[PDB]
């Protein structure tokens, strides 16, 4: 197994927030683009990164990849629900529950980035990341959309120094 397996698993699990968010934004007619990359969130992210002793620019790059992957899922869901509205989730999303999950996923990702900073800067990162993704894609039974979104979300993991 790869040492990035848990970091990638946390990222893949975090991508699934897209399903509740699209389900809510669909009914509420909210823009998918209004996703939170605002100065207050960027500063909080950087202050949380410095608190974990990891590079804020690196962490910001990771979450810039993550948000793009998340929006991409929401757009594909909107595409599916436009073609066949009946396939839309019947159940309302539990966003109070999702809020606490995201907080836990964020912390796990940041502590994992610190806990594996040496590997993320190493030449073996690329091979380790590829093995991690396949494990997570197999173990999480990720479909084509989530696989590609996981690739987008993790494409800067090995840009560490």
């Amino acid at each position: 197994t790869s040492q990035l397996a848990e970091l990638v698993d946390a990222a893949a699990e975090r991508l699934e927030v897209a399903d509740p968010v699209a389900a809510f934004k669909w009914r509420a007619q909210l823009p998918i683009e209004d996703s939170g990359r605002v100065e207050q969130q960027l500063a909080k992210l950087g202050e949380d990164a410095r608190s974990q002793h990891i590079d804020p620019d690196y962490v910001t790059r990771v979450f810039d990849d993550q948000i793009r992957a998340t929006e991409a899922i929401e757009y594909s869901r909107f595409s599916d629900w436009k073609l066949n509205p009946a396939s839309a989730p019947p159940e309302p999303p539990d966003l109070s529950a999702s809020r606490s999950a995201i907080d836990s996923l964020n912390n796990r990702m940041l502590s994992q980035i610190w806990s594996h900073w040496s590997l993320l800067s190493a030449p073996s990162c690329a091979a380790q990341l590829d093995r991690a993704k396949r494990d997570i894609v197999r173990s999480r039974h990720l479909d084509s959309l989530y696989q590609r979104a996981l690739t987008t979300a993790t494409q800067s993991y090995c840009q560490a120094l």
Partner: peptide
């Protein structure tokens, strides 16, 4: 708005 960039933040409209 409903945000997912860093925190899942939710303001009622």
């Amino acid at each position: 708005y409903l945000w997912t960039y860093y925190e899942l933040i939710f303001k009622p409209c």
